[PDB]
């Protein structure tokens, strides 16, 4: 059922899309075809310049995935040159003091960490996002 929506999404992602990890190694759609979708929601990604990008966040095992709308299809997020696929391995989450609808995500990696700021539609949604990610990281090997 959740795997049903997962498959439908995968088919709406463009074939040649990709994003670059901090270690220079490139992550492509083909690698996503194996995965289990845990959660999916529309959020906003805050840029370093204070802008908000419309994002579709997909919590999987074993990663977290950010997508943008390219008309009818989806693409990996290209925001502030950050990787749009986050490994759950050493991922943590904190709440934004400035806004209760927002959460910080810091992904430790092999080429060094990276920080993300995500705003949801409510404090309940933020709270749900945090413990959901918290539990995915817990059960991620």
């Amino acid at each position: 059922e959740k795997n049903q929506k997962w498959l439908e999404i995968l088919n709406k992602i463009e074939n040649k899309t990709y994003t670059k990890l901090k270690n220079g190694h490139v992550f492509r759609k083909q690698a996503l075809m194996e995965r289990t979708l845990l959660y999916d929601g529309l959020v906003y990604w805050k840029t370093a310049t204070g802008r908000f990008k419309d994002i579709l966040a997909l919590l999987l095992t074993d990663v977290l995935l950010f997508l943008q709308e390219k008309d009818q299809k989806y693409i990996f997020a290209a925001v502030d040159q950050k990787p749009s696929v986050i490994s759950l391995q050493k991922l943590i989450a904190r709440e934004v003091a400035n806004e209760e609808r927002g959460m910080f995500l810091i992904s430790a990696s092999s080429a060094g960490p990276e920080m993300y700021e995500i705003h949801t539609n409510s404090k309940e949604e933020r709270n749900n996002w945090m413990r959901r990610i918290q539990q995915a990281v817990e059960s991620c090997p």
Binding site: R94, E95, A97, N98, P113, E114, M115
Partner: protein, 177 residues
């Protein structure tokens, strides 16, 4: 209100999180619990000005040297902290923490903070540094360190007794107004 961002740095276990928590909540934390990244905020009036103060706790451990800078962008004022009862943390102010702040955020006010003030007089703590062949940090040593790193103020405070705690943060705002 006027948004002002303050980042707290310093060696590990110098008292940053307690210093931060004690100010915003008036409660001392329970257990130690080393920090990796924590964000706090507090609304205070300084010189009749309403300020939305953003506080960014950092990890004092070396293992997070790559992580710490992620909280530095758009900082308005820095708080470099050493412990008045750990001369090693005092030496890391010029060795690690001022060069790091300087490298990432040049031309950004710095306040050098003296933490754990109540332990410099606590005799039960003074002798424990004698055995290690160490002596607590005096005021003049810190004020000399402050003008060395070009800091605006040198302030001493204690998170446990809250002596001088409200001064450290009032002065941090005035360095921004």
């Amino acid at each position: 209100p006027q948004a002002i961002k303050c980042v707290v740095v310093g060696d590990g276990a110098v008292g940053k999180t307690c210093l931060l928590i004690s100010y915003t909540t008036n409660a001392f934390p329970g257990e130690y619990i080393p920090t990796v990244f924590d964000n706090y905020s507090a609304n205070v009036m300084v010189d009749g000005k309403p300020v939305n103060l953003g506080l960014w706790d950092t990890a004092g451990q070396e293992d997070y040297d790559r992580l710490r800078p992620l909280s530095y962008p758009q900082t308005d004022v820095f708080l470099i902290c050493f412990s008045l009862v750990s001369p090693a943390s005092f030496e890391n102010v010029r060795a690690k923490w001022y060069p790091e702040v300087r490298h990432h955020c040049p031309n950004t006010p710095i306040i050098l903070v003296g933490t754990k003030l109540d332990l410099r007089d606590d005799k039960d703590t003074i002798e424990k540094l004698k055995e290690k062949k160490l002596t607590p940090i005096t005021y003049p040593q810190g004020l000399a360190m402050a003008k060395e790193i070009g800091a605006v103020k040198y302030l001493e405070c204690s998170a446990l007794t809250q002596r001088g705690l409200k001064t450290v943060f009032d002065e941090a705002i005035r360095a921004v107004l």
